Amino acid sequence: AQIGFMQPHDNFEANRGGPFKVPVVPLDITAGEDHDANGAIRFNYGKQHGE
Amino acid sequence: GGGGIGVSTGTYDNQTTYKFLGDGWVEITAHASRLLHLGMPPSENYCRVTVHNNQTTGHGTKVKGNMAYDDTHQQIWTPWSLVDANAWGVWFQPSDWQFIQNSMESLNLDSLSQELFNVVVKTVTEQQGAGQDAIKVYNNDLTACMMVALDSNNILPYTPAAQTSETLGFYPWKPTAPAPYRYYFFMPRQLSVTSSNSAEGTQITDTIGEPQALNSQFFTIENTLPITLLRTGDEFTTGTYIFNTDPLKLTHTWQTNRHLGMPPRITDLPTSDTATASLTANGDRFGSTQTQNVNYVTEALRTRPAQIGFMQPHDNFEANRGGPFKVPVVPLDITAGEDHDANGAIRFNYGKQHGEDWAKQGAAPERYTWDAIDSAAGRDTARCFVQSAPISIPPNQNQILQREDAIAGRTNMHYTNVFNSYGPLSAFPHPDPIYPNGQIWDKELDLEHKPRLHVTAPFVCKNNPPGQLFVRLGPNLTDQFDPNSTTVSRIVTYSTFYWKGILKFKAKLRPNLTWNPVYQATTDSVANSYMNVKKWLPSATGNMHSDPLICRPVPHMTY
Amino acid sequence: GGGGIGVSTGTYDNQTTYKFLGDGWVEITAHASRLLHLGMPPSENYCRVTVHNNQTTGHGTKVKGNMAYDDTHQQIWTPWSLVDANAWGVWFQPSDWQFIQNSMESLNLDSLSQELFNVVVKTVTEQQGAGQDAIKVYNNDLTACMMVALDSNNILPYTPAAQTSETLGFYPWKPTAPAPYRYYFFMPRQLSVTSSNSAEGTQITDTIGEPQALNSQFFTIENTLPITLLRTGDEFTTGTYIFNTDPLKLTHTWQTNRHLGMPPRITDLPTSDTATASLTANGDRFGSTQTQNVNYVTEALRTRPAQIGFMQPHDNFEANRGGPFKVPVVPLDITAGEDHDANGAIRFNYGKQHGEDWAKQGAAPERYTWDAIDSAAGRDTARCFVQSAPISIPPNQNQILQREDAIAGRTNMHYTNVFNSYGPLSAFPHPDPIYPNGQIWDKELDLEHKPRLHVTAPFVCKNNPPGQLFVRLGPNLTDQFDPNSTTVSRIVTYSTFYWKGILKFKAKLRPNLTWNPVYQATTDSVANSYMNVKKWLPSATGNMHSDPLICRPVPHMTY
Amino acid sequence: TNRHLGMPPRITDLPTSDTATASLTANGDRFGSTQTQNVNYVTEALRTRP
Amino acid sequence: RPNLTWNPVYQATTDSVANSYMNVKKWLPSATGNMHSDPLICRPVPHMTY
Amino acid sequence: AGRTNMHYTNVFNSYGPLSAFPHPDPIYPNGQIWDKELDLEHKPRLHVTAP
Amino acid sequence: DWAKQGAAPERYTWDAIDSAAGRDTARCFVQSAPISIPPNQNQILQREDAI
Numbered sequence A: 001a002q003i004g005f006m007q008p009h010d011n012f013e014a015n016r017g018g019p020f021k022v023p024v025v026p027l028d029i030t031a032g033e034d035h036d037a038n039g040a041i042r043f044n045y046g047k048q049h050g051e
Numbered sequence B, C: 001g002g003g004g005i006g007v008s009t010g011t012y013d014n015q016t017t018y019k020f021l022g023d024g025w026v027e028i029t030a031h032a033s034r035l036l037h038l039g040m041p042p043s044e045n046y047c048r049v050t051v052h053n054n055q056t057t058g059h060g061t062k063v064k065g066n067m068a069y070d071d072t073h074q075q076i077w078t079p080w081s082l083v084d085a086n087a088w089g090v091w092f093q094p095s096d097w098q099f100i101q102n103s104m105e106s107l108n109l110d111s112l113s114q115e116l117f118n119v120v121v122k123t124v125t126e127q128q129g130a131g132q133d134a135i136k137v138y139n140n141d142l143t144a145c146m147m148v149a150l151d152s153n154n155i156l157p158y159t160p161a162a163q164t165s166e167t168l169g170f171y172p173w174k175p176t177a178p179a180p181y182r183y184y185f186f187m188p189r190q191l192s193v194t195s196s197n198s199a200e201g202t203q204i205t206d207t208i209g210e211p212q213a214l215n216s217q218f219f220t221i222e223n224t225l226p227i228t229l230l231r232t233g234d235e236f237t238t239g240t241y242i243f244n245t246d247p248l249k250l251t252h253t254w255q256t257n258r259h260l261g262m263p264p265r266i267t268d269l270p271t272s273d274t275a276t277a278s279l280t281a282n283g284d285r286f287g288s289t290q291t292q293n294v295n296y297v298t299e300a301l302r303t304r305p306a307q308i309g310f311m312q313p314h315d316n317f318e319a320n321r322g323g324p325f326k327v328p329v330v331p332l333d334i335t336a337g338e339d340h341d342a343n344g345a346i347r348f349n350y351g352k353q354h355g356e357d358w359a360k361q362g363a364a365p366e367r368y369t370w371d372a373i374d375s376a377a378g379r380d381t382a383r384c385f386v387q388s389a390p391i392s393i394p395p396n397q398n399q400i401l402q403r404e405d406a407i408a409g410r411t412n413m414h415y416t417n418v419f420n421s422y423g424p425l426s427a428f429p430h431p432d433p434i435y436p437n438g439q440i441w442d443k444e445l446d447l448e449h450k451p452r453l454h455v456t457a458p459f460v461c462k463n464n465p466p467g468q469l470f471v472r473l474g475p476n477l478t479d480q481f482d483p484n485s486t487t488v489s490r491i492v493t494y495s496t497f498y499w500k501g502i503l504k505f506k507a508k509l510r511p512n513l514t515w516n517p518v519y520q521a522t523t524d525s526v527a528n529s530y531m532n533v534k535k536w537l538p539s540a541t542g543n544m545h546s547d548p549l550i551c552r553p554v555p556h557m558t559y
Numbered sequence D: 001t002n003r004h005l006g007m008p009p010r011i012t013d014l015p016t017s018d019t020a021t022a023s024l025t026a027n028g029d030r031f032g033s034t035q036t037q038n039v040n041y042v043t044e045a046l047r048t049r050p
Numbered sequence E: 001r002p003n004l005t006w007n008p009v010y011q012a013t014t015d016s017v018a019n020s021y022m023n024v025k026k027w028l029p030s031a032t033g034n035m036h037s038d039p040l041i042c043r044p045v046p047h048m049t050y
Numbered sequence F: 001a002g003r004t005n006m007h008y009t010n011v012f013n014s015y016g017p018l019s020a021f022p023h024p025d026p027i028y029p030n031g032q033i034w035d036k037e038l039d040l041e042h043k044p045r046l047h048v049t050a051p
Numbered sequence G: 001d002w003a004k005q006g007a008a009p010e011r012y013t014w015d016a017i018d019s020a021a022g023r024d025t026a027r028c029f030v031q032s033a034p035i036s037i038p039p040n041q042n043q044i045l046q047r048e049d050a051i
Helices: B094-103 C094-103
Strands: A011-015 A018-021 A042-044 B016-022 B025-039 B047-051 B073-083 B104-128 B134-140 B146-151 B179-184 B189-191 B206-208 B227-230 B236-242 B251-253 B287-289 B316-320 B323-326 B346-350 B366-370 B380-387 B400-402 B468-473 B493-509 B554-556 C016-022 C025-039 C047-051 C073-083 C104-128 C134-140 C146-151 C179-184 C189-191 C206-208 C227-230 C236-242 C251-253 C317-320 C323-326 C346-350 C366-370 C385-387 C400-402 C468-473 C493-509 C554-556 D032-034 G024-031 G044-046
Touching (some): B094 B104, B104 B146, B104 B468, B104 C104, B104 C134, B189 B323, B323 G024, B468 B493, C025 C104, C025 C468, C104 C146, C104 C468, C189 C323
Parallel strands (some): B251 B554, C251 C554
Antiparallel strands (some): A011 A018, A011 B380, A042 B287, B016 B025, B025 B493, B047 B073, B073 B179, B073 B468, B104 B134, B104 B236, B104 B493, B146 B227, B189 B206, B316 B323, B316 G024, B346 B366, B346 D032, B380 B400, C016 C025, C047 C073, C073 C179, C073 C468, C104 C134, C146 C468, C189 C206, C317 C323, C346 C366, C385 C400
């Protein structure tokens, strides 16, 4: 079988509600360090939450 | 006592009953009864028939670019006819559909039973009067029979008549006819791909093949099915079929990926009713995105649980041993861009029996385009775009791919044509039930990997579909008969009979939790309005017409 | 309740069912239902009718050498007609036959039952219109009857319709007709033997005699059988007949006398794949022969357990009080020499009802030559020879008798024509079942010494055959009737009715013990191939044709 | 294939000879459903399939 | 398998034709005992999808 | 389409019947533990934001 | 085949017996919406076109 798969990036689809980036299954960025391709998550938080 | 020519073998019931069981559950029993007509087949033979549109002119397939006009196929033509009740308009009044759409959250199939009764066979005789005007005489043939076959095991190719608009009529007081039964037969079909700009020296390959041993299946009703013979006192019953199917939502979803989850916090409330609130600067704002190149969070870049709707290739034509065909498309919201082919809007063609206006003249059928009621899962293609990683906001022209861009140097080809965004994260609603003209249920393809849904019907039977019901008139033979001759002489004969059927449903009344009033399906008195009641009322001369009614008027919350 | 003109008295079932009982045993129930037609006899009398072909020219029997054209006989012509279901093509689809031939080692008859139902009698009336064109009017005669007689005791001469190709049609959706019943009546028949070289002064004795007291038997249906009268609400059943018969092998034998027993030992194995091994010199080799004059053993001279196949006289014409007839021949492999008459290949002639191509034009029937599937028991006549004892190897011309030698000074006469090698050691397989056109079962001759087999059918009934089923329309009389007059005036009348029958079989699935794959009966897509599927499929206009299918594709080991 | 699914279109008449090819009701007049709305006709290639 | 068709069905069979892929000589030993086994067709009989 | 930085890998979707991949990784401290399922007839195989 | 000589292995290409689900690629094409029949060269994408 196929382990992992290619994913469109950075895909922006639009509906009656405006443009949005299509989410991406988080996967290994490998050696090429491809984040958007493999869906690395970048989150932003304050001191209450561990800043 | 038990039988005779002068007693009726069944009752005419076309009324729809509502049984309210409690806890909001509704048993809906739809009775439908129709006067059915039958006539002798043009031939008593099984015929293996080819259609080939190599006309070199007009719409023919030897003209460059007409690939999508291909009708080429081959079929087994049978003397048998098909009684097919599967459409919504058979089973409900326009008001019944309204009451279910407004008051019910969900709907599901329960059971089906069918009957044939009061068979009448007549023969036609010429009678010669003065003035060289022959009048027809109509005589009961009391001993004549009608042949009836039910396929319970679904041995025969499954052949829904709703897709050709051949189902029983939608008007209970109008006589109707069964459809002549036919099924595809494998034929090799090869057709080249050309455009109207193709070179003049180009030769189009348009070819059909000979029957193939590995693919050839010829079935006959007589060898595969038990056949009942109905004389005028005889009656036929299919028994009761039990549906095993998934319930159908009578509500639609409005939420897109922009509408999922926690909205961002507004800094302050608006100052006036015309004012617009602001958010914490995107550089300072909490949240998560899957684009790391930029250090900010925006409503468009926020990570969402999943993908609502997906992009679909259009208009995709794939070819096999059987010729070119357009790949079907999941019906979805055409949105604001009014993208039909992209989102798979269905356009169906039908006649007066099925709700075309009777006052309308000409051979042209009534045409209607059904757009999905769902406003969540569609895709506006002009507003879609793709950017390169690492994401650069704003992108330059080389860093973005947008619909005006030409694929393979073809002006009107855009990546959105070949782009398939379907994946593990895609989530969308089921196809919408279409009234009157839509197919209620459908057979499941027999393959190891089955599709998630069918485009053409809301309900798919989990094991075996209801059996198809076949009828024909037998040969009525004259005194001159040679069994070794090819040409039979037979008496002119036709029959009429009554079909009744009973279709049961499980419905559940909808909850009302909103403050604001809800969108409902209503008729109006406004002139030229689509919902003007004059359309659902008879005319002066009795002309009827029934137009598609909205379904799923009430929204529900996706998440 | 129990009867009436408006109810059906039976059901149409023509489907074939397979019941797998376990341990490889299969119950095969073949249902067959056919719309049957009947019409008034040309005469209501029993007629004693003579055919005499003394035409002096053409094919007549007063021409020298035309002895084998003799049709001369005498028959009782009866007003009754015969419903005869005995042929293979009545009971099976071409695919059913394939599945039995590929998957089954053996087959045997179990039971037979028959029914007649939905009798419809109509009268024809002339109706005079303008233009001197009379149109026919078709009216139900509700009180008219059809006469039905079953002979369970087999009093009447047994008259298989498969041999004249008069059985019911092979196509379930095509109307068919019963055969008019007739039986031979003893007449003296004397015909001289001449050749085309016979002297001009030669007088041919061609003579028929008067009825003979010792041999005369005239039977009538009415005096010998109970007769049921069927009106339109009446139904008729034969009950269930039970076959007592020997099973039939669905496999064929390849082993000749050269293939029996221990092969001789090879000295060494071959050196290469193209090499041929050698045996110990025949003078030194162990073994036994029945020729003592020579002191050596060869594969041809080895003593074998028995004789597989035997020589048969051909073409033998024996004469009795009833005229010349060709002696039948056990069907056997025509081998490589393609010797048909020697090995008894059967050539049968049939019409479109029975599987001639419907597209074919002309009065000429379809002709087919059936060769036995067995490759063991045949006899290549050109390769046969006889040598004198004490055996001299090599023989001179006087010590050997070979096929080119002329018997009685007649160039084309050879000893193989008159040579009968049948004896206590002869062993051969049973005649092969022929589909569709072959006869399934047959009556046993009533004589004290019975033949080992019949040529024309696989199954012979051990005690009594299934009863023959007779039908006729009675006289429909006008108002003018004189019982003392010879000329009756009667109403033009015909009937239609449905015949159904149920034929059960015991089959057993075949063992598979070989390494190599086995020969199977398969259709192919190759153009002009005999097995091309296009032959078993309908045409564009609905033309069908069914051609003989191979039987016994799988070999088994004789010894 | 997808061309072989469902109800075939009705032939106007049966073929005249075994070499003849039957015709269908003109695609502009023919009943059926497609997912391409820009054109007002139904063809075997454009028919909606399950 | 059930047999419901009128026409005969495609079967997997060996043949005697020279150079044919299904020629029995391939499934038989040679003079020196050489064997070879080649892929055999599977699924010769069709069934109806829909 | 003659766009220097656009590559087929941007629009390429290899997902198919043969694709096999693990579930999204639980993120501590900041990750969401559980999530509601979307109410739709065809549901996604996973959510990106929660295990 | 045992009679065969050399170190080269036996090679065989298995084609699926299924005649339903395949895809003839030269005969496949994509057209632009709104569909124009017949398309001009810019309104159709066919296999001879270069990506």
